[PDB]
Structure formats: C-alpha cells, structure tokens
Design a protein around this ligand. Structure first.
Ligand SMILES: [Mg+2]
Ligand SMILES: [Mg+2]
Ligand SMILES: [Mg+2]
Ligand SMILES: [Mg+2]
Ligand SMILES: [Mg+2]
Ligand SMILES: [Mg+2]
Ligand SMILES: [Mg+2]
Ligand SMILES: [Mg+2]
Ligand SMILES: [Mg+2]
Ligand SMILES: [Mg+2]
Ligand SMILES: [Mg+2]
Ligand SMILES: [Mg+2]
Ligand SMILES: [Mg+2]
Ligand SMILES: [Mg+2]
Ligand SMILES: [Mg+2]
Ligand SMILES: [Mg+2]
Ligand SMILES: [Mg+2]
Ligand SMILES: [Mg+2]
Ligand SMILES: [Mg+2]
Ligand SMILES: [Mg+2]
Ligand SMILES: [Mg+2]
Ligand SMILES: [Mg+2]
Ligand SMILES: [Mg+2]
Ligand SMILES: [Mg+2]
Ligand SMILES: [Mg+2]
Ligand SMILES: [Mg+2]
Ligand SMILES: [Mg+2]
Ligand SMILES: [Mg+2]
Ligand SMILES: [Mg+2]
Ligand SMILES: [Mg+2]
Ligand SMILES: [Mg+2]
Ligand SMILES: [Mg+2]
Ligand SMILES: [Mg+2]
Ligand SMILES: [Mg+2]
Ligand SMILES: [Mg+2]
Ligand SMILES: [Mg+2]
Ligand SMILES: [Mg+2]
Ligand SMILES: [Mg+2]
Ligand SMILES: [Mg+2]
Ligand SMILES: [Mg+2]
Ligand SMILES: [Mg+2]
Ligand SMILES: [Mg+2]
Ligand SMILES: [Mg+2]
Ligand SMILES: [Mg+2]
Ligand SMILES: [Mg+2]
Ligand SMILES: [Mg+2]
Ligand SMILES: [Mg+2]
Ligand SMILES: [Mg+2]
Ligand SMILES: [Mg+2]
Lengths: 178, 60, 134, 143, 259
RNA sequence: AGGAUAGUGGCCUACCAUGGUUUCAACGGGUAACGGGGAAUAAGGGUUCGAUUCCGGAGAGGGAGCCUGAGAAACGGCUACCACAUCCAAGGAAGGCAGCAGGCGCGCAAAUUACCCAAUCCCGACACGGGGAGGUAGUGACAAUAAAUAACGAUACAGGGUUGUAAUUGGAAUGAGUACAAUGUAAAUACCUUAACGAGGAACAAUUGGAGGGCAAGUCUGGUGCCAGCAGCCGCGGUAAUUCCAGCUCCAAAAGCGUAUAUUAAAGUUGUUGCAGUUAAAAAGCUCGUAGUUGAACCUUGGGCUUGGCUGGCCGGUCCUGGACCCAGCCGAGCCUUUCCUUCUGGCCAGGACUUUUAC
C-alpha cells in the first residue's frame, strides 16, 4: 500500500494532576497571554523540555566538537531568528535559562496587542481568528503563529479588512443600507 | 458468604427524592473566555479574609 | 479592482512534445478568481498564440484570495496540441467530444459473459436457440 | 563479595539466576502461565457478554450493613457463571431475567472491592443500552 | 517464490532516485539491461523527476515512442531501460547530450556534455578471457562484449569505447596514481588518485584514495572505476563539484557565501 | 561405488564401519510464536510489544500428487481422497473471498455488494487494450495537527495612584451553515477562493468527571435514616450526612472527558548498574567434590638528542583575524643508549619467502 504519513504529538501533561503551586501559575500565565485552555501552555513546556534535552547532550561533548558546533549554533541561530533569544546571549548556556514567557512573547496574538493594533490581549486573538490580520501580504488566522524578526515590521491590517482600508463588513452594510 | 436478601427496596432513596428543577441560569463562557473569567477571579480582585482564601465560601 | 495580472516562472521549452510549459501566477484582487477560459484568452494575447494551443489546469487559490498558482502549456500548433494532450483536457477546452461508454460494471459483466462462448456469437446464439425447442 | 557472581565471564549464571528468580514476582507468573487466559472468567478480555440468570442480592461485609444488588450472569463466550454487581440507586429494576448484559471488571484486577464478597464484575450495559443512560433517562430500554 | 518479481514498491526503490513517499504505491521497476537494478536509473525518472520535461508517466511514453531518446547511439523506447554509469543519452530534438556520472552527493548528476565528448565512453573491465575458437574478449561494466582487445588490457582497467563502432580506442592500466571515481559505498562520487592498493587473497582488495584536498578514504576494489591516466587528467568531463566531498560545516559555509 | 538432480550432499540405493548431539542444557514439551526493519515507556541501565503500509518466509478448507512453462508441487491450474456443500428430469454435472465489496457466524471488538484507470505502476503482439494493483468518494471521535463557542465602548456604582471588576445599554467583527460562480476532479465531493444570505438570551446555549483525605474544589439547603446507596484505598449512611439521592455553589480537563483490561515508569517491589537473608520472607545439619565461576608477584624502566602539529599569552604584526622568535601545557614522530621493530630483488613502492595462538 501507500507509504505511511508521519505524525507526532505536540504536548505533554503533568505527572501530578492537582498541585496548586502550578495550577495557579498556569492560569496566571494563561490570563496574561489570553490563552483558550491549558493545552496551549502544555505545548510550550513540551517544546522547551526537548530543547533542554538537546542542549544537555551537546553541552556534554567537548568544545570544538563537530556536532556541538554545527547543531548547537544552528539551533541558536533559529532561536535568535524568531526573536526568542537575544543577540548577546548566543552561548547555549543562556539557552538553558529560557522560560515559557519568552515563547508566548513571540506569538502573533501577543505581538498584535503589544503593537497597539488591539485594545486588549483577548481582542488580539479574535482579530486574528476573524481574518483581519495579515503578515506581509498573506492573511494569517493562527494565533500561535510565531513571528520572526524580519516579519515583525510587516504586521498590519489586511488590505481587504474594514479596519485596514477594505470594504465595510456585514453588519454595517445592513444598517446604512436601510 | 451466606448471601440473599429482599430485593424490594431497590431505588428507595432516589424514588422518594423530591424532584427539583434547575433554574434556567445564564450560560457560562467557553474556551478562551472562561480562562479569562477565572484569572481575574483568582489574581485581580482577590476576596481574601486576611490570608483566609476560600473558592466556595459557604454563606457563613 | 479587476487588474488580472499574470506571471510565468519555471518556463521550459519542450520540442519533444512540441510545446512550452510553465507555472502560472494570477493576481486578481477584488475578484473571486479567474476562470480557465478567461486565463486562456489572456495568454493568447500576451504570447501571440492561438487560444486552442493553450492549456491550464491544477489551480488553487491561496489563503485570503487574490492569488492563484497553476500549470500551463502552450503548443507549437493546434495539431500538435491535439496529439499530445489527455482526453479530459481536450473535452474541457471543447476540442473533443466526451466518449460515451457504459459503467465499469457493465463492461466487465459483458466481458465475462462473452467469455463463456467459444467461436462466433452467431454460432453460439443460433445453436443455443436450437437447444431451446420451445 | 556481595554474594552474586561478578566475573566477566559469568553472564550465563547471571541470566539464568534472574530468570529463575523472576518467577517469584507473582505478576510475572500470571503473564507467562497465562492464568488470565486459563483461569480468568473473561479469558483475558476486558469485557464479556452474558445472560442474567437471577436477581439475588449480597450482604455487605462488616462493619457495613447493606444489600448489594447483583445478578447471576452466564457468559456467552464460555458458559461460565459469574456474579455481577448492578451499580447505582435502583438499577436492579432495569435488569430482568434472561436479559443480555455487557460486563466489565470492578477495577481491582481480579479481586473484590469494598464490602462486596466474591464479586469481581459490574454491569455496564443491558440489552445493548448503557445502564448509566437508563439511570439518567437519556435513553429507554429496548423492549 | 514461484517466479521473478515484476513490481517495485515505492519505499523499496533505490534511495538515490530521490522519489517521494506519498506520490503512489509503486515505483518504476528498471528493466533487465546493461546495468544492475540497484545501480541504474530508469528513463522515466530522468525525463520527469530530473529534467521535469514530462509531467507524468503517460508523457514519458509519448516522448520515447516518437524515437527521440538514444542511449549509447541507438534509439531506445523502453521506458524502464536501466541506463547507468558512463551511458550517453541523446535528445536531438533539444540538441542535448548527457553522461551519467555520480556527483559527490551520491546521486546521478544531470551532466550535459558536448557532442564531441558524447561520441565515446569508458567502461571498466570486469574480466578478460578466451571465447569460442580462442578469441579473447573483454566485458565492460555495461555488459558490452568487445572481441580482440589490446593484449595488455587486464581486469579493473578502463577502456575507451568508440560508442559508434563498439571498438576500443585506447585504455588505462590499473596502477597507483591513476584518477578514480568511486562507484559504491558511502564515498560514492568522490574523485581522487590511487594511493595504495591493499591486497587480500581470498577476500576483497582495498584501494586507498587521496582526495584533491589530501583527504584519505578506503573503498572496495569493486567500487573503483579508473577515469584518467593521472591526477587532473580525466578522460571525460566531471560534474559540478569535481567529485570533492565537503563536510557539512564547509557546505553550510559554502552555501552562506553563495548568497 | 552408483542412481537421481539443474547441480553439492545419506538426497536415495548397494556394501561397509560405529559413529553424531548433550549440564557451555542436547533431546523433549509449551508458546494466548511467522522473523526483521521497527512500537510503547523511557536519567542511565532496562521492561514490554511488533497479526498489520517495507524486506524475507509460509498458505490458499485439510492433505497428497502432478500438467504446462524459463520459472508453480500454482490452487481466481488440474488429479484423487477427507470435511463441508450446489443443481438434477435421479441418468448425471459442477465447487473453494486468508482478492474487492458484501452476507452468516463469532464475539468486547472493526466501514460501501459505490466511481475510475486521470495519477502510481504492472501485463500484452501494444504510443491505442486490461488492471477491486492502484486512485476517488462513502462509513469512520483508532490515533495525530491547528483551532470557534465571543471582542470593544458609554452610564451607574465601589475601589484602589491613573484604571480591574460588579449590573443595563449601544453599535461594530466574523465563520459554522448556506449559496450563485470559479477553482478543484476522469467526473464529482470536499478543501482554498468568493457576490447575495447567515449572531443578543448572540436558544449558533460544552461536555465529562469530581468537591473528607490521597487530590483542586462546601461542614451550604432539602430528602433518607446501617435502608437506599457511595466508596480504586482509608472510609461515608441510626434525624443539621463536608462522602448517598437532589438543588445551589465550586474544582479539574475540554471537543473532549470517564470506565474495564493489558502494559511502561514510579519499582533500588527482579536489583549488572542496584535489593534483601540474626529477629520482618529468606544461609542447605555438616564435610568432600565434578562441571561453572574466580584465581599472589615477576621479563625495556629510565636517561639523552632532533623534529612535526595545536592552546594560553608576551610579542600584536587588531581586521573577531594572521608570522620566526619566547614560555609553560597537550598529541605524535625519528635516532642513541648491549635494543625488540620478520626476511630478500628491482634502487619507501612493487615483486618473492616466513610468521605462537587468542581476548581487548
Ligand atoms: Mg487553585
Ligand atoms: Mg469469445
Ligand atoms: Mg506484568
Ligand atoms: Mg504464554
Ligand atoms: Mg476495611
Ligand atoms: Mg448488552
Ligand atoms: Mg547500453
Ligand atoms: Mg556420490
Ligand atoms: Mg546430487
Ligand atoms: Mg547420514
Ligand atoms: Mg499452537
Ligand atoms: Mg502461532
Ligand atoms: Mg512487524
Ligand atoms: Mg515477535
Ligand atoms: Mg511481523
Ligand atoms: Mg494471531
Ligand atoms: Mg508483506
Ligand atoms: Mg505458495
Ligand atoms: Mg477460508
Ligand atoms: Mg495447491
Ligand atoms: Mg481465491
Ligand atoms: Mg494468484
Ligand atoms: Mg492445469
Ligand atoms: Mg472480503
Ligand atoms: Mg471499534
Ligand atoms: Mg458492511
Ligand atoms: Mg492509470
Ligand atoms: Mg486501493
Ligand atoms: Mg484524498
Ligand atoms: Mg477523541
Ligand atoms: Mg458549542
Ligand atoms: Mg455550507
Ligand atoms: Mg455548500
Ligand atoms: Mg468566483
Ligand atoms: Mg457537573
Ligand atoms: Mg484540598
Ligand atoms: Mg438534611
Ligand atoms: Mg433531614
Ligand atoms: Mg443535611
Ligand atoms: Mg468543608
Ligand atoms: Mg470525596
Ligand atoms: Mg452532593
Ligand atoms: Mg480548564
Ligand atoms: Mg526505569
Ligand atoms: Mg535499599
Ligand atoms: Mg526487598
Ligand atoms: Mg518469628
Ligand atoms: Mg571445579
Ligand atoms: Mg596476575
């Protein structure tokens, strides 16, 4: 038959379901970034948990090792590229010091509110879902879309959106046409 | 075990529980809105009694 | 508003099949999309070819609309196009008539029915008729 | 010298000694002896259907005092007779003699739970309809 | 298994064809021919996956049935014909001549050559022995049988085939210092000179090869194809990269500057 | 020695020896056993699984035997028997879904008797035919990805330095859905695009489990009263039950949530890493002893000389970057020390002759 298509899980749940010293921390963190549910918080911890695992393995090798130099710098370059890692912290020891708020900072939902295009963070998510925001010349409706540094400057309203020079929406057309 | 007994009393308490209807209360928000509701309720306007915090305070 | 804009990339000249082949980018803001028939007319104007030597297919509109990407063929002649084209595309363009045949079940059942006869059908049916004395 | 052999060429003794001694793990014996396959009423399955033989009722263990309302069920797959608890307030009235019931374990993985003696199964469905659906009036018994 | 296999599952095809997983259930099974199944390139892959001249399998059959494709100076119409190393493909409609030489990345490069170089080819001598009536003959890597060879020619040597008459123009004796391309193993496609031939009676002889960068690697004698009389003097034009293997860090650096 | 085979061979025959395997586990039995690539969990070491997208193997109800052919002990080929089983005019004849779809049965357990060769490839005398192989759709909460179920303002209060909410008041925004249409396709469906339609209780209404502890969240109200029931475990019910049945409120995860079973970690409760054995389970009553396991020390060390490469610097020779000279440090050589380092021809590469066996 046809070749199988690969797929994988993108999150992992806590070992202890009920622990206030984490439930409150998660909710405080979800409220700050306007997240829908706890799984969007589990997802950040999962990808940060395997980056740490990758970083530990390269750090055990000797310096100037070919694998440590190639993959460590490449992973760092991508992290600087998405704006998570600062240009003065490319040492793979500050990589271990990263925290989940660094990744939620680079989401499209976080950047739209923080760019002044929205009144609040919950306004940012609904603007994205309702096809109002375009990055470059492409409409993006994914709130978790991670903004790159070179794409940061090109965040604005969609060219055919009511708020960005487009036509009037469905509701307004119903009132002014009567 | 020595096992038997009258089967006549099945459902005794549930049958005689007086049926009480649920008041037709407003719907709760779903998704992102409900997490927003809980966050303020636990970190913005905290209702603590001098360190004394209750999620479901009985009317006492 | 309308402003249909056509860009061609990955152009390959293919004298093996007597045609030129390329990728088509269509920019159509304030327009749902452009029909293949309308794309074929415009291509004839741009490249000074007969409309019947031009073939487009496999179009998909990007997210948010306003742009589509597809594949296009331009043959050196209409005769060359008629030789090196799938039947279904010529039927799409009106250069051929859709062939009419029974369903696959009917062809297969008929094929297996003829398999029980050795020789001509005329011999088989006259002789089978002879058996049924009625 | 810690009692077990340590020599570099004593792998056969180490492999056999562990192999002999894992039989002391009761969980391990049941997996290799196939006791669930041989002795368990379900034959290793998670669930099993059967026919209700009789409504009886089981006296609870001390210090509790109650009548746990069960049924006697004959399994379709192997003809064995088992006792199955009927959970919730008044669900025994949903189960009649010569009804088809779907069973599952009590969750203690072959042992009895609580004060119910010698009962290791619970009723999940009757006549192909969930007992919980019958209890909460989501569905009605097909009869 | 009651008889020969006639299908090739997509996942079981040779990896150097660079076929995608999800395009279908099956892959083109190369026909019997001058080159081994695992070491060949079917003509369907070249015209559609490599040149991307054909859009599908229907189109490659239409191209070849009009007599356009020639391999080694004869028109071939077998869509799964196993073209291999040193084979010449001619498309006179497009006026293009190709030679199948491995690039250093292990794949068959799309290497266009001039018509002057496309008029001959090289073949590695597998065996020299006497035929019927005591006529000596040479078997090259593509199954050609050439009679009456130069009596100095031995196995593992490379001969220059006229490719129009099938005769031997001249040859290169197998010895230290000859230019070599590797036709097997993980060093496939690398180009260097023989440094040391390591003999093992009853086993596999090993050849020591020096890169143009004085990098040393070892490969089996069955993977050695003599292509030149000395360093820097190949008898055919090499593909882009000249068969020199770069490390991934050098490749990343090389890609960074070319942009 | 022969015969047979495509061919080696006790493969078989004739004659002849008495050999062959085995406690380093032969042989036999079991396997809820097709092998592997691989899967789940995983600090490490491990434990468990792999019928199933690829490779190899085996079978076509069970056996056995064959024809044709290069290739079959083939089964959508045949012959015979066994078990099933079909038509019959009673003389006879004909069967093989562990192919696709479908039916019965079995069960805890699994979808359409649909469209097409357009793609992927295969077969043929072949540019043309065929292909339930394969592709398309249908059923489909197996799993997997993203991700709606609302957002922003004004009043009115409260409030804290300038704004976070608790109520009743507005106008905006959008896709779920619908649909001209175009795209998609062999033809369709759907997706993606997109006119018009399509949101105030925005009834376009999120559920599943819980609220004594483990374990996050009630000593609220009513009902029952060792009954009914709950309760994985400890425990809860005899009149204000924090645990039942309900209502309210609250907690947890959410298009998902619970239950049963198996399995992995937790388990240093299988322990090589890494358990325990006086009394909690556990040193054979005591010696000998074969196999197994395991076994004291000892044979070229030191010194001297020359050289290759790279780290810190001084030099700095700075466009983060490069030199002899110098210091320490690190890796390799090449000679001499009574000197292992096989031995010869063309003259370190190619052509001859020798070599204690291993483990690492
Ligand atoms: Mg909490
Ligand atoms: Mg016929
Ligand atoms: Mg187990
Ligand atoms: Mg077993
Ligand atoms: Mg007890
Ligand atoms: Mg049932
Ligand atoms: Mg050839
Ligand atoms: Mg013999
Ligand atoms: Mg023989
Ligand atoms: Mg014998
Ligand atoms: Mg068996
Ligand atoms: Mg088996
Ligand atoms: Mg497998
Ligand atoms: Mg297995
Ligand atoms: Mg398998
Ligand atoms: Mg099985
Ligand atoms: Mg297979
Ligand atoms: Mg077979
Ligand atoms: Mg069968
Ligand atoms: Mg057979
Ligand atoms: Mg069959
Ligand atoms: Mg068959
Ligand atoms: Mg036959
Ligand atoms: Mg079937
Ligand atoms: Mg199922
Ligand atoms: Mg069905
Ligand atoms: Mg086809
Ligand atoms: Mg299929
Ligand atoms: Mg599809
Ligand atoms: Mg699900
Ligand atoms: Mg909803
Ligand atoms: Mg719709
Ligand atoms: Mg519709
Ligand atoms: Mg349109
Ligand atoms: Mg609830
Ligand atoms: Mg608590
Ligand atoms: Mg009360
Ligand atoms: Mg009371
Ligand atoms: Mg009370
Ligand atoms: Mg309480
Ligand atoms: Mg409780
Ligand atoms: Mg309650
Ligand atoms: Mg939640
Ligand atoms: Mg572990
Ligand atoms: Mg311990
Ligand atoms: Mg212990
Ligand atoms: Mg004692
Ligand atoms: Mg001994
Ligand atoms: Mg010693």
């Amino acid at each position: 038959p046809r070749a199988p298509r690969t797929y994988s899980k993108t999150y992992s749940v806590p070992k202890r379901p009920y622990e206030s010293a984490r439930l409150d921390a998660e909710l405080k963190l979800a409220g700050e970034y306007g997240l829908k549910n706890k799984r969007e918080i589990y997802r950040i911890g999962f990808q940060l948990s395997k980056i740490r695992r990758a970083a530990r393995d390269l750090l055990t090798r000797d310096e100037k090792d070919p694998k440590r130099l190639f993959e460590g710098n490449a992973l760092i370059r991508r992290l600087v590229r998405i704006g998570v890692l600062s240009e003065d912290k490319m040492k793979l020891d500050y990589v271990l010091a990263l925290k989940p708020e660094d990744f939620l900072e680079r989401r499209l939902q976080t950047q739209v509110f923080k760019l002044g295009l929205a009144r609040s963070i919950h306004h940012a998510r609904v603007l994205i879902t309702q096809r109002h925001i375009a990055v470059g010349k492409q409409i993006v409706n994914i709130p978790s879309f991670t903004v790159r540094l070179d794409s940061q400057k090109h965040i604005d309203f969609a060219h055919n959106s009511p708020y960005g020079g487009g036509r009037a929406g469905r509701v307004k057309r119903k009132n002014q046409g009567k | 075990g020595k096992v038997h007994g009258s089967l006549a009393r099945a459902g005794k308490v549930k049958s005689q529980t007086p049926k009480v209807e649920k008041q037709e209360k407003p719907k709760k928000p779903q998704g992102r809105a409900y997490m927003r509701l809980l966050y303020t309720r636990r970190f913005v306007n905290v209702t603590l009694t001098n360190g004394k915090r209750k999620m479901n305070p009985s009317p006492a | 508003s309308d402003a249909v804009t056509i860009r061609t990339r990955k152009v390959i000249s293919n004298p093996l099949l007597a045609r030129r082949q390329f990728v088509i980018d269509v920019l159509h803001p304030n327009r749902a999309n452009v029909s293949k028939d309308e794309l074929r007319e415009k291509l004839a104007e741009i490249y000074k070819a007969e409309k019947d030597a031009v073939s487009v297919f496999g179009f998909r509109t990007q997210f948010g609309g306003g742009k589509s990407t597809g594949f296009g063929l331009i043959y050196q002649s209409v005769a060359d196009a008629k030789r090196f084209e799938p039947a279904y595309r010529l039927v799409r363009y009106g250069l051929a008539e859709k062939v009419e045949k029974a369903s696959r079940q009917q062809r297969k059942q008929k094929k297996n029915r003829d398999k029980k006869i050795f020789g001509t059908q005329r011999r088989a049916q006259k002789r089978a008729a002879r058996r049924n004395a009625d | 010298g810690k009692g077990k052999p340590r020599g570099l060429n004593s792998a056969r003794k180490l492999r056999v000694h562990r192999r002999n001694n894992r039989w002391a793990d009761q969980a391990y014996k049941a997996r290799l002896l196939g006791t669930a396959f041989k002795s368990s009423p379900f034959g290793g399955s998670s669930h099993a259907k059967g026919i209700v033989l009789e409504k009886i009722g089981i006296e609870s263990k001390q210090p509790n005092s109650a009548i746990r309302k069960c049924v006697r069920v004959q399994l379709i797959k192997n003809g064995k007779k088992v006792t199955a608890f009927v959970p919730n307030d008044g669900c025994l009235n949903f189960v009649d003699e010569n009804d088809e019931v779907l069973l599952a374990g009590f969750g203690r993985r072959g042992k009895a739970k609580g004060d119910i003696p010698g009962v290791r199964f619970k009723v999940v469905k009757v006549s192909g309809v969930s007992l919980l659906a019958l209890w909460k009036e989501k569905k009605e018994k097909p009869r | 298994a009651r008889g020969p296999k006639k299908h090739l599952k997509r996942l079981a095809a040779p990896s150097h064809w660079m076929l995608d997983k999800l395009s279908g259930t099956y892959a083109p099974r190369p026909s019997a021919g001058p080159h081994k199944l695992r070491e060949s390139l079917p003509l369907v892959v070249f015209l559609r996956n490599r040149l991307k001249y054909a859009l599908n399998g229907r189109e490659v059959k239409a191209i070849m049935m009009q007599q356009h494709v020639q391999v080694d100076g004869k028109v071939r119409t077998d869509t799964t014909y196993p073209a291999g190393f040193m084979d010449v493909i001619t498309l006179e409609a497009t006026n293009e001549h190709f030679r199948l030489v491995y690039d250093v990345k292990g794949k068959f490069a799309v290497h266009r050559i001039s018509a002057e170089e496309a008029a001959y080819k090289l073949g590695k001598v597998k065996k020299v022995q006497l035929g019927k009536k005591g006529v000596p003959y040479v078997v090259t890597h593509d199954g050609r049988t050439i009679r009456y060879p130069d009596p100095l020619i031995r196995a593992n040597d490379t001969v220059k085939i006229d490719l129009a008459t099938g005769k031997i123009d001249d040859f290169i004796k197998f010895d230290t210092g000859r230019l070599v391309m590797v036709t097997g193993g993980r060093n496939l496609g690398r180009v260097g000179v023989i440094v040391h031939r390591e003999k093992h009676e009853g086993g596999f002889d090993l050849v020591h090869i020096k890169d143009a960068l004085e990098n040393t690697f070892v490969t089996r004698l069955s993977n050695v194809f003599v292509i030149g009389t000395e360093a820097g003097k190949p008898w055919v034009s090499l593909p882009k990269g000249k068969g020199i293997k770069l490390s991934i860090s050098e490749e990343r650096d090389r890609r960074r500057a070319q942009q």
